[PDB]
Design a protein around this ligand. Sequence first.
Ligand SMILES: CCCCCC/C=C/CCCCCCCC(=O)OC[C@H](COP(=O)([O-])OCC[N+](C)(C)C)OC(=O)CCCCCCCCCCCCCCCCC
Ligand SMILES: CCCCCC/C=C/CCCCCCCC(=O)OC[C@H](COP(=O)([O-])OCC[N+](C)(C)C)OC(=O)CCCCCCCCCCCCCCCCC
Ligand SMILES: CCCCCC/C=C/CCCCCCCC(=O)OC[C@H](COP(=O)([O-])OCC[N+](C)(C)C)OC(=O)CCCCCCCCCCCCCCCCC
Ligand SMILES: CCCCCC/C=C/CCCCCCCC(=O)OC[C@H](COP(=O)([O-])OCC[N+](C)(C)C)OC(=O)CCCCCCCCCCCCCCCCC
Lengths: 286, 277, 278, 279
Amino acid sequence: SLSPVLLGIVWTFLSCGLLLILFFLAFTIHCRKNRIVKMSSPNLNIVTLLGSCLTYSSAYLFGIQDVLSMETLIQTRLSMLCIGTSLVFGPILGKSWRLYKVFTQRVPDKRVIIKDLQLLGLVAALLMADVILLMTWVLTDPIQCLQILSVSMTVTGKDVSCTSTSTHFCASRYSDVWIALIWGCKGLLLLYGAYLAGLTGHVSSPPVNQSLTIMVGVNLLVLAAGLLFVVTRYLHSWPNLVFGLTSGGIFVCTTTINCFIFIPQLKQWKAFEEENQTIRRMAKYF
Amino acid sequence: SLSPVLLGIVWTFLSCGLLLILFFLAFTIHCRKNRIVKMSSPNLNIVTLLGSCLTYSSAYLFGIQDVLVGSSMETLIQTRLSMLCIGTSLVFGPILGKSWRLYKVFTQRIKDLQLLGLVAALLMADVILLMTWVLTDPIQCLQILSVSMTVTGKDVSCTSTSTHFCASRYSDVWIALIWGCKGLLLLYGAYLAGLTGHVSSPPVNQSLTIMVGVNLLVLAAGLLFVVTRYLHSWPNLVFGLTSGGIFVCTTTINCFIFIPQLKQWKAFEEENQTIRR
Amino acid sequence: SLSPVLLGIVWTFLSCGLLLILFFLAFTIHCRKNRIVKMSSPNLNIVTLLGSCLTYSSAYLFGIQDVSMETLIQTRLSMLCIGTSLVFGPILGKSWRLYKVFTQRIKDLQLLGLVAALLMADVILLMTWVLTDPIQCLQILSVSMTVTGKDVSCTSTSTHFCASRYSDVWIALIWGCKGLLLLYGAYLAGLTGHVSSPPVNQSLTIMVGVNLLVLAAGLLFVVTRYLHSWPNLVFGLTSGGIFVCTTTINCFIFIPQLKQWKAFEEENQTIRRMAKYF
Amino acid sequence: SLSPVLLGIVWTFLSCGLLLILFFLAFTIHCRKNRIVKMSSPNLNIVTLLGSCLTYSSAYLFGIQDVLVSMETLIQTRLSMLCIGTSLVFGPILGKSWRLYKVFTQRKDLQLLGLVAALLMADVILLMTWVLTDPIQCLQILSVSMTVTGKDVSCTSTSTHFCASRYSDVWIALIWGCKGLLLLYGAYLAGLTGHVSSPPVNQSLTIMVGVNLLVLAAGLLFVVTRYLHSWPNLVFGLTSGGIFVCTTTINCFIFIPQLKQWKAFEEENQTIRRMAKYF
Ligand SMILES: CCCCCC/C=C/CCCCCCCC(=O)OC[C@H](COP(=O)([O-])OCC[N+](C)(C)C)OC(=O)CCCCCCCCCCCCCCCCC
Ligand SMILES: CCCCCC/C=C/CCCCCCCC(=O)OC[C@H](COP(=O)([O-])OCC[N+](C)(C)C)OC(=O)CCCCCCCCCCCCCCCCC
Ligand SMILES: CCCCCC/C=C/CCCCCCCC(=O)OC[C@H](COP(=O)([O-])OCC[N+](C)(C)C)OC(=O)CCCCCCCCCCCCCCCCC
Ligand SMILES: CCCCCC/C=C/CCCCCCCC(=O)OC[C@H](COP(=O)([O-])OCC[N+](C)(C)C)OC(=O)CCCCCCCCCCCCCCCCC
C-alpha cells in the first residue's frame, strides 16, 4: 500500500520528535525547582508535552492502511488529534491569561478561588468541549467505510455526458457538519488566544511571555489544517502524498510549538548556571 | 419557491440597514472637521461604509431565483459571492488599519495613504483569489441524475437521486483558500485588537469592534456554510439565514463603530452650547 | 525644660509605632514562604523595618536636652539620615525590579547592592560632615548696632546654639541628594503605574512617602531654625513628623499584605471546610 | 564693582539664549498649523517661551550692583521674575504630559491654561505675602561677639552690609517646598507617560532633565549666595550660568526634536513633489 521508504522516513522523524518531547519532559520534571523553569509554568508545560505526545502518536497511526476495524482506527486517530491539539493549546492560553491578570490587577481583586477556577476553565472546559463534540460525532454519525458503485448521467446546458465510477471511502454521512463544528470551536478559542497574545505583547520575556509562540502556532495550525482538509478530500488517490503531508504537518506544528516553548527555557537555564558557576569559582579562588 | 412574506420582511430589514448606513455616511461626510469625528479617521470610515453597502447589496442578490432576463444563474451566484467577499474585505480593512495606527503611535510614533495602501493590497489579494477561482473553473450548474448501489459489507441499498446544484468541480479548495486567508486576517486583527487593549476611548480604540466582528464572522460563516451545504432543499430557510447573518454582522460592526462617535459628538455639542450661554 | 506630659505622650506614641514595626517584622519573618508575602519581597521589607526602627530611635533621642551634646546631636541626625535611606531604598528597588520584569526582562543581591551604594553616599556625606567641621555648641554674646540708612537701633543678645560653622552647605547637600533620590523614585512610581496590585506595586506608597517627607522636612527645618525658644513645640513637631511619616509609609507597605493574607487563608479555610463536609 | 569682562561675557551668552528663544517663538507661531507643530501644543509652547524670556531677563538683573543706591526693589523684582518664569516654564510641560496621559487612559488647551493659572496664582500669593509681610531690607550692622566655647574664649569684630529678609529661610523653605512638590508630581507624570509616544509629544526626558538640573542649580546657588557674598563676580557668574544652562537645556529639549521632525517632513514633501514632477 504505502512505500516502505516513506514509512521509514516518517517513522524516523516522528520518533526523533517524540524523543525531543521526552527530553523536554525530563528537563521540566528534573529542573522543576530551578528559577528559570519555575518562573514558567512547568505543571502546564507537562500538559502541553502530553498533548504533543498524543499528536505524534496520531501521526504514527495515520500510516496504517489496508491492515485493519478501519472505522475505529480513523475515529481514534482523529480523536487523538483533537484532544492533543486541545491539550497543547489550552496550557499556553492559560499561561497568557495568568500573565495578563497578574499585571492588570485593581482594587477589586475578586477571589483567588475564582482566579484558579478560571485558569482551570481555560483548559479543562475546552477539553470537555472537544470531548462532548467527539462523543456526539461518534454516537450520532459514526464513520462508515462503504463502497458505492454508481452510474451518473449528467447534462450541461447543451452537452450530455455519462460516467461510471466506483469508490471505497470512509466518512460520516454529515461529515462537513462535524468539520465545521470542530474547526469553528477551535477557531473561536484560537481567536481569543490571539487576543490574549496581543494583550500580553510586551509584558515580559519570551520564557514567560508566550505571544510569539501563540501567534506562530495559530498561523501554522490554520495553514496545516486548511491544506490537509483539502488534500485529504481531493487527493484520495495519492496515499503516499496524503500520508506524508499529514505526518509532516503534524510534526512541523508540534515541533515548532514545543521548540518555541522550551528552547528559551534551556537558553536562560544555561545562562543562569554559567553565572552561578562563575561566581562560585570566583568566591572559591578568594 | 420563496415565500412573499419572507422576501418582504428581509427586504424591509435590509432597506433599514442600508438607510442606517447612509445616515452614518452623511454624518461622517458632513461633520468631517469636528474633533470627535476627525479623531476617529472619517476618511477610513468611508471604506467601511462602502463595504457595508456592498454586503447589503449581496444580501439582496441572495434572494432571487431562476434568471433576471434570460440571464445566467452562474453569473448571479459568482457576482453575489464575490461582492460579499469584497465587501467583507473593505469592512475589515480600515478597522485593522486604524488599530495598527493607534499601536504605532503608542509605540515610538503614519498617514492615511499608507493604511489605504495596505487595504488596497488586501483587496488585491482577494481580487486575485476571486479571479483565479472564476477563470480556473466557473460555478456551472449541472443536472445530476444517477443510480448508486451502496455496499457497506453487510447490506445492499439502491437509491435514485435527481439533484441540481450550482457549484465548482473543486469547490472546497476555493472555500478553504478564501476562508483561510480571511481567517489569517482575523487572527492578525485579533492580535492587533489585543495590542491596542485599553489604549484609548472606544471612539479611537477599535478593539471591542474587532473582537465582536471576528466572532460573529466565524459563527455566521460556519453556520451558513453548513446550512447551504446540507439544507439545500430549504430555500426559504437558507435565504432567511443567509440574509439574517449578513444583516446582523454588518449592522453590529457598523453600530459598534459609529454609536460612540454619535453620542460623543452630541455630548461635545451640548457642552459647547452650555458654555456659550 | 520639657514638660513631662508631652514627653510621656510622645514616648507612648513612639513606643506604639515601634510595636507596630515589630509586629510587621514578626509577620514578614514568620510568613516568609506564603505566596502573598513572598510576592512582596520579604527580604527587602526587613531593611525598611530596620530603617523605621532607626528613625523611631532618633525620634526618641530628640527629646533629651541637657546631657557631650555635640555627640548626641550628630548621633541622632545621622541616625535619622541612615534610617530614612534604609526605609526608602528597598521601595525604590522593588519598583525598579517590577519595571524591569514588566519591560522585557534581578536577584535580591543586586538590589541590596544598589541600596548599599545609596547608603554609602549618605555615610560618605555624614563622615565628611563630622570630620570637616563638627557641631560644636558656642555661647554667643554680642552687641549689634543696626544702621539701615534712616534709623539707628542697638540690641544686645546672649544666644546659645549647637550648629556647624557652615551648616547650610551640609543641609543643601543632604537635602539635595535625598531630593534627587526622591525624584527618581517618583519617576519609578510613575513608570510602574497601575502595573500590578498594591502589595506588589509600590506606587501610591512612594508618592505619599515623598510628599510627606518633603513637607515634614521643610516644616521642621524652618521650626528648628526660628522657633528655637519653643523647646516643647520643636520637640513635639519633630517627633510627630517622624512618627507620622514612618507610620504612614510602613502602613501603606504592610496593610495590603495583611488583608490579602487574611483573604487567602479565609479562602483556604473555606476550601478545607468544604472538603471536610464531603 | 563687577569686572567688565565677566559682565560682557554673561551678557553675550544671555543675549544668545534670548535670541534662541525668539527663534523658537517665531518657528512656533509661523508654523502653528504644521502637522508636527500641531500634534505638539504650540499655545502651551508659547507660555513656556515667555517663561524662558522672563528667566533670561532676571539673569541680566542679577548683574546690576552698586548702581541703584532702590536696591531692595531690584532684588525683589529679580527674584519674583525667576519664580514666575520657572512656573511658566514648567507648568505647560506638566500640562502636556497630563493631557497625553489622560488621552491614552480613558474610560483642551483652556483647561490646561486654567491649571497653570492656578499654579501661577500659588506663586503670586506666596510672593505677595513675602513682600507685604517681610520685605527685603538693606541694612548695615556692626557688632562685636565674644565667642566662648566650653574652655576657650575669643572675640571678633564684624561689620557687614547685606540685603535680606528677616525670616528669609521661611520664605525659602516655602517656595522651594511648593516648587519641589510640583516637580515631584511632574516626575510622576513623566513616569506615567514614559514610553507612550515620541519625544516631540512625549515630554518625559525633558521633565527629568529639567527637574534634576533645576534641583542641582538651586541647591548650588543657595549655598554660594549665602556663603560667598565676598565673591561678587563668582556668585554673579554662577547664578547667570545656572539660569542660562537650565533655561537653554529645557527649551532645546522641547524644541529641537520639533525642528528635526519638521525638516524631515519637509524633505519628504519635497521628494514626493519632485517625483510627481518626474511623472
Ligand atoms: C499541534 C499539532 C496538531 C495540529 C495538526 C493539524 C493537522 C490536521 C490534519 C487532520 C485534518 C484532516 C483530516 C480530515 C478528516 C478525515 O480524515 O476524513 C475523514 C472524515 C471526512 O472525510 P472527507 O470528507 O475529508 O473525505 C470524503 C469526501 N466526501 C466527498 C465523501 C465527503 O472525517 C470526518 O468525518 C470529520 C471528523 C472530525 C474530527 C476532528 C478531525 C481532527 C481534528 C484535528 C484538527 C483540529 C485543530 C485545528 C482546527 C483548525 C484551526 C482553527
Ligand atoms: C461583515 C459581513 C460579512 C459576513 C457574511 C457571512 C456570510 C456568509 C454566507 C455566504 C457563505 C456560504 C455560501 C458558500 C458558497 C455557496 O453558496 O455555494 C456555492 C459554491 C459551493 O457550493 P456548496 O459546496 O456549498 O454546495 C454544493 C455541494 N456539493 C456537494 C456539490 C459540493 O461556492 C464555491 O464554490 C466557493 C466560492 C468561494 C467564494 C467566497 C464566498 C463568499 C465569502 C464571504 C465570507 C468571507 C469572510 C468570512 C469567512 C469566515 C472567517 C474566516
Ligand atoms: C521616613 C522618616 C524620615 C523623615 C523625618 C523628617 C524629619 C526631619 C527633621 C530633622 C531635620 C531638621 C533638623 C535640622 C538640623 C538641626 O537640628 O540643627 C543642627 C544643625 C543646623 O542647625 P540650624 O541651622 O537649623 O540652627 C542654627 C541657626 N544658625 C543661625 C546658627 C545657623 O545641623 C546641621 O548643621 C546640618 C546637619 C545635616 C545632617 C542631616 C539632617 C537629618 C536628615 C533627615 C532627613 C533626610 C531625608 C529627607 C530630606 C528631604 C527630602 C528630599
Ligand atoms: C528653568 C529656569 C529657572 C531655574 C533657575 C534656578 C536658579 C536659582 C538661583 C536663585 C536662587 C538663589 C538666590 C536666593 C535668594 C537671594 O538671592 O538672597 C536674598 C534673600 C536671602 O538671602 P540669603 O539668606 O541667601 O543671604 C543673607 C544671609 N543671612 C544670614 C543674612 C540670612 O532672599 C530671600 O529672602 C528669599 C526670597 C525667596 C523668593 C524666591 C527666590 C527665587 C526663586 C527661583 C527658584 C525657584 C525654582 C526652583 C526651586 C527649587 C526646586 C524645587
